[PDB]
C-alpha cells in the first residue's frame, strides 16, 4: 500500500495514446489538429517530466482512436512519438509514427503567389528528404521547399 514517495499519474481506462510529444508541441498538434472538437474526455498531460525529459507532452482521450493515417501526419511534428490502443486499463496496439509522403490540410505555402491563399482549398505538401531537410513539394504552385521553412511565418 502507501509507501515512501507519493508519485504521479497512473494508467487511465481507455482511448488513444501517443507517447512522447516534444518540448512545447502538445498544443502545436492539439491546435493544428484541433483534438478538442470531441465529446470524449480530453485529459492533457502537459509540462510534466518523463525520465530525464524535463518537459514532455501527451494527449489523453477516451473512446477515440488515432487512425493509421493520423499517425503518419504527425511524424514531422513529433518524430519520436508513440500511438497505441489502450483497452480497459490495458494497452495494446503499438502504432507509433512514421513519416508519410502526403500531408494534408495543415501546413502553409511560403509561396506568396501560390493560389492556396485566396481560394478555399486543401493544403497539400508532398514529402521527401535530403539529410537535414524534408522537402515538401506544393500541390498547387509545385514549388519545392523544406520543413525548416513551411513550419514558420
Amino acid at each position: 500500500m502507501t509507501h515512501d514517495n507519493k508519485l504521479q499519474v497512473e494508467a487511465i481506462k481507455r482511448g488513444t495514446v501517443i507517447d512522447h510529444i516534444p518540448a512545447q508541441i502538445g498544443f502545436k498538434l492539439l491546435s493544428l489538429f484541433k483534438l478538442t472538437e470531441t465529446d470524449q474526455r480530453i485529459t492533457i498531460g502537459l509540462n510534466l517530466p518523463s525520465g530525464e525529459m524535463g518537459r514532455k507532452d501527451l494527449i489523453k482521450i477516451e473512446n477515440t482512436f488515432l487512425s493509421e493515417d493520423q499517425v503518419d501526419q504527425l511524424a514531422l511534428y513529433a518524430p519520436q512519438a508513440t500511438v497505441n490502443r489502450i483497452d480497459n486499463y490495458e494497452v495494446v496496439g503499438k502504432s507509433r509514427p512514421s513519416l508519410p509522403e502526403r500531408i494534408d490540410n495543415v501546413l502553409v505555402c511560403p509561396n506568396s503567389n501560390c493560389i492556396s491563399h485566396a481560394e478555399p482549398v486543401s493544403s497539400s505538401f508532398a514529402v521527401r528528404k535530403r539529410a537535414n531537410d524534408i522537402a515538401l513539394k506544393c500541390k498547387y504552385c509545385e514549388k519545392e521547399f523544406s520543413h525548416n521553412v513551411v513550419l514558420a511565418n
Binding site: 503567389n113 501560390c114 493560389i115 481560394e119 478555399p120 498547387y140 509545385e142
Partner: protein
C-alpha cells in the same frame, strides 16, 4: 478511349513520355489533313485572366480550325475593379456549367490545378499559370524540335538567357530528360544561370549537362539553340548592359553552324536575337510559332475525342 481523353492538361511534370509521343504524333499526323469541323457543335472557353495575345490568338485560332466555338475573355487591368471577393473557385463552377473544355491563363501559381477541383467533368488546359507551368509552350517547342531535327533524342540543346526565372526553359529541359542522350549546354549570366533545382535531377538521370558563358563556344557542337529573353527589369541597367553582349545572338556567330541546326525563341524578342539572323536558315522561331497550332489542336483533340480515327 484514348490514353489522354478528358485528362486535365495542367503541368508537364504530370504528362508522360507516352502521352507526349501521342500528342506530338497527333500534331504532325493531323498536320497533314485538318478537319475544320472535328469538334463541331462544341464550345471551348478561353478564360485569359492574365492577358497574352500570342497564346490567346493561337489557342483561339486552333479552336477554330477544329470547327469549335469560343466564348471567353482576355481580361487586362482596367478590370482591376474585379479584385472584390468573387473567387476563381466560383468563377469556375459557374463557367464549368456553360462549356466543354476550359482554356485558362492566370497570374497566380495554382490556377489551372485549382479550377480542376471545381470543374471535373469539364477538363481544363493550362495556357500558363504564375511562374509554374505552360505545358502548351513546351509542347510546341518539342514537336517543333522533332519536325526539324527529325529525331527527338540524342540532341545538342543550347539554352541562353534568363535560365533562372525563365519558366519556358525549366519546362522544356524537364520534358527533354524524358528521352535518351540529349546533350545539354546552358548559357546564361552568372546570376541568371540555371538553378540546382533542375540541375540535380538532371545529373540524377545521367543526363549530360554543361555550362558556358559564350554561345561562341558551344556553337559548332549544337543542334537546338533556344533563345530565352533576358529582361532589363530583372537586372540593373548598368549590369544588364555589361552582362549582355555574350547573351545575345547575331548572324556573325552562326558562321559555323551545323546546317542541321535551328534557332528557337519562346518569344517575343527585343534585344536578344538580331534581325540579320532572320535570314540564316537556323532562324526557325517564327515557323516554330506556327507549329503551336497543331500541338494545341491535338491537345484538345484528344482531350475532347473519346477516340481518334482520322
Amino acid at each position: 478511349a484514348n490514353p489522354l481523353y478528358q485528362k486535365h492538361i495542367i503541368s508537364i511534370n504530370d504528362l508522360s513520355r507516352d502521352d507526349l509521343n501521342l500528342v506530338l504524333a497527333t500534331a504532325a499526323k493531323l498536320k497533314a489533313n485538318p478537319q475544320p469541323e472535328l469538334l463541331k457543335h462544341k464550345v471551348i472557353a478561353s478564360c485569359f485572366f492574365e492577358a497574352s495575345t500570342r497564346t490567346r490568338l493561337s489557342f483561339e485560332t486552333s479552336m477554330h480550325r477544329l470547327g469549335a466555338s469560343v466564348v471567353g475573355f482576355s481580361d487586362s487591368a482596367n478590370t482591376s475593379l474585379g479584385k472584390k471577393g468573387e473567387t476563381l473557385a466560383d468563377t469556375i463552377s459557374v463557367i464549368s456549367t456553360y462549356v466543354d473544355a476550359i482554356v485558362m491563363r492566370h497570374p497566380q501559381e495554382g490556377a489551372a490545378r485549382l479550377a480542376t477541383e471545381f470543374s471535373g467533368n469539364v477538363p481544363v488546359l493550362n495556357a500558363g499559370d504564375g511562374s509554374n507551368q505552360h505545358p502548351t509552350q513546351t509542347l510546341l517547342d518539342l514537336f517543333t524540335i522533332q519536325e526539324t531535327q527529325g529525331r527527338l533524342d540524342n540532341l545538342h540543346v543550347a539554352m541562353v538567357g534568363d535560365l533562372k526565372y525563365g519558366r519556358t526553359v525549366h519546362s522544356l529541359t524537364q520534358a527533354l530528360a524524358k528521352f535518351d542522350g540529349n546533350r545539354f549546354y546552358f548559357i546564361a549570366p552568372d546570376a541568371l544561370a540555371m538553378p540546382q533545382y533542375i540541375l540535380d535531377m538532371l545529373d540524377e538521370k545521367g543526363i549530360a549537362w554543361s555550362l558556358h558563358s559564350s554561345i561562341e563556344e558551344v556553337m559548332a557542337e549544337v543542334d537546338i539553340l533556344y533563345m530565352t529573353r533576358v529582361q532589363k527589369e530583372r537586372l540593373d541597367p548598368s549590369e544588364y548592359a555589361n552582362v549582355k553582349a555574350q547573351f545575345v545572338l547575331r548572324a556573325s556567330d552562326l558562321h559555323n553552324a551545323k546546317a542541321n541546326m535551328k534557332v528557337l525563341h519562346p518569344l517575343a524578342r527585343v534585344d536578344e536575337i538580331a534581325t540579320d539572323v532572320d535570314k540564316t536558315p537556323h532562324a526557325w522561331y517564327f515557323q516554330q510559332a506556327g507549329n503551336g497550332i497543331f500541338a494545341r489542336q491535338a491537345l484538345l483533340a484528344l482531350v475532347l475525342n473519346r477516340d481518334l480515327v482520322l
